[PDB]
Design a binder for this molecule. Structure first.
Ligand SMILES: CN(c1ccccc1C(=O)Nc1ccc(S(=O)(=O)N2CCN(c3cc(Cl)cc(Cl)c3)CC2)cc1)S(C)(=O)=O
Ligand SMILES: CN(c1ccccc1C(=O)Nc1ccc(S(=O)(=O)N2CCN(c3cc(Cl)cc(Cl)c3)CC2)cc1)S(C)(=O)=O
Ligand SMILES: [Mn+2]
Ligand SMILES: [Mn+2]
Ligand SMILES: [Mn+2]
Ligand SMILES: [Mn+2]
Lengths: 231, 231
C-alpha cells in the first residue's frame, strides 16, 4: 500500500510520540510502496540550520526508509512551513507543493495538509498569507538562530478550526478528483460528499498523541487506520 | 488477524449498507482467524421465526464465512437482543455472553456491545433490565408475529448516550484486562486510560452507514480501521 501520515507535531518534550514514529518508520513504512507525510511533522520549525538533535534523529530515521527502497514525500503544514531543501536532502524526502494530485493505482487522489481548506479562520489565513511570502521567509531565516527562537517562543505562546465544506468541494472540482486526503484539523474521519456531481470521499488523518493514524491506499481499498502506542 | 465489527443496523431500507457487509464477508472476512460481531447486526429483531428475507440472506452470507474455516461469534446489542439459537444455527455463529474475555495471541481482551457501560442513561438501562428478563422474552416471542411487529413499530418510533468512564474502569478491573473492544456508542475511536493501575486501551467501533469499520487484532498490532463504501 501507499501510506499517508500527518500531524505528528514531534518535539523533544513528547518522546513517547517520537518512539511511536520510529517504530512506524522501522516497521510498517518498510512494507509500503511510498510514504507521504502531509505536514506538521514537527511542532515548530525556524530553519534547517537548527541543531535540535531531534531533527537529525528524525532525518536519519526517515532517510532509512527511502534508502530501503520506499520513496518518501512531504507537504508542509502550518507548523513546519520553513522546512527546507537542506532538511529534505538530509531526510531523503521529496518536497511537494501545498496541493498535489497523485495517480495511485489508477485513482486520482488530491493531497494537502488541510489548512488551505479552513477558510473560516480569518486570523489563521491572514497569518498563513504573510508567512508564505518568500521574501519574508528569507528575511526571517537570515536572523540569528537565538533571535528566531525568541520570536518562535512568543508566537507559539501567541482549538483548530475545521474545514469549510464549500472549500472542500471547490478544491476537489479544481483538481478534478473524487478523493482527498488531508490532516491539519485533528479530526480523523472518513467523509462522503459530492464533487464533480459524483460521489466523493474525504479522508482525514489524526494527530499523534495517544495514538497514531495512517491512510493506506491500494488498488481496491482506502483505509483510515488508528493504532494506540501500546509497545 | 482476528476481526471485530458492530453496529451494522442492517435493514431492508438501507441496501447500500447490506452490500458493503456482503463485500466484507466475501473478502476481508475470509482471510481472518475469526470474526466477532459485537451487537446491533440488525436494526431490529422480534424473533427468529421472522420471515424477513434479509435475515436468511445474511444468515447464508455469514455461514459461508464459518464454512470457509473462519469461526464467527456474536454478542447481542440493544437492537437485536432477541436474536436466538435458531438464527445462530442458520448463520453458523456461536452466541457469546454480554461480556466476554478473549485470549487473543496471549493478550486478554474484554468484548461487549458497549451498552452495559452507558450507565448514565437511566431510561435505557431501565428498558434493558426489563427486556433482558427471560420470562418476558419468552412471553413476547409467543405473541403472533403481526402483533410483535405492531409493538416494534411503536417502540422503534418511541442520540445514543456515551459510556460512563467509571463503568469502563470498573469492567476492565472486574475482568482483569488492559484491553476492551466495544461498539454501541457510534463514536469510533481509540482511547488510552488506566485500569488495574496500568495503561489500558478501549477501542470503539463505529456504525455502518457511509463507512464500515472493524478492529483487527494480531500478536503485535491492534488497529481500528474505517473504510468508505466506494465500490
Ligand atoms: C492553527 N495554528 C495557528 C492559528 C492561527 C495563527 C497561527 C497559527 C500557527 O500555525 N502558528 C504558528 C506556526 C508555526 C510557529 S513556529 O514554528 O514556532 N515558527 C514558524 C516560523 N515563524 C516565522 C516565520 C516567518 Cl516567515 C516570519 C516570522 Cl517573523 C516568523 C516563527 C514561528 C509558530 C506559530 S496553531 C493554533 O496550531 O498555532
Ligand atoms: C439506545 N436505544 C434505546 C434507548 C432507550 C430505550 C430503548 C432503546 C432501544 O434499544 N430500543 C429498541 C430496541 C429494539 C427494538 S425492536 O427490535 O424493534 N424490538 C425488540 C423486542 N421488543 C420487545 C422485547 C420484549 Cl422482551 C418485550 C417487548 Cl413488549 C418488546 C420489541 C421491540 C425497539 C426499540 S435506541 C435510541 O437505539 O433505541
Ligand atoms: Mn496538526
Ligand atoms: Mn496543521
Ligand atoms: Mn448501534
Ligand atoms: Mn447499540
Amino acid at each position: 500500500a501507499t501510506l499517508f501520515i500527518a500531524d505528528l507535531h514531534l518535539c523533544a518534550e513528547e518522546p513517547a510520540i517520537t518512539a511511536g514514529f520510529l517504530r512506524f518508520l522501522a516497521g510498517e513504512a518498510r512494507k509500503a510502496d511510498a510514504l507521504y507525510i502531509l505536514g506538521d511533522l514537527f511542532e515548530a520549525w525556524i530553519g534547517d540550520d537548527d541543531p535540535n538533535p531531534l531533527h537529525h534523529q528524525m532525518a536519519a530515521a526517515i532517510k532509512a526508509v527511502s534508502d530501503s527502497g520506499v520513496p518518501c514525500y512531504f507537504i508542509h503544514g502550518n507548523r513546519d512551513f520553513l522546512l527546507g531543501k537542506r532538511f529534505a536532502r538530509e531526510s531523503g524526502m521529496t518536497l511537494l507543493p501545498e496541493e498535489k494530485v497523485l495517480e495511485l493505482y489508477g485513482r486520482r487522489v488530491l493531497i494537502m495538509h488541510g489548512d488551505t481548506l479552513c477558510t473560516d479562520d480569518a486570523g489563521y489565513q491572514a497569518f498563513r498569507a504573510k508567512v508564505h511570502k518568500p521574501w519574508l521567509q528569507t528575511l526571517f531565516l537570515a536572523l540569528p538562530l537565538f533571535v528566531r527562537k525568541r520570536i518562535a517562543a512568543r508566537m507559539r505562546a501567541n482549538a483548530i478550526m475545521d474545514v469549510n465544506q464549500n472549500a472542500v468541494v471547490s478544491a476537489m472540482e479544481k483538481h478534478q478528483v473524487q478523493w482527498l486526503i488531508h490532516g491539519h484539523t485533528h479530526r480523523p474521519a472518513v467523509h462522503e460528499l459530492i464533487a464533480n456531481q459524483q460521489t466523493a470521499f474525504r479522508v482525514v488523518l489524526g494527530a499523534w498523541h495517544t495514538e497514531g493514524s495512517m491512510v493506506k491506499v491500494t488498488a481496491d481499498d482506502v483505509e483510515l487506520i488508528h493504532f494506540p502506542f501500546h509497545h
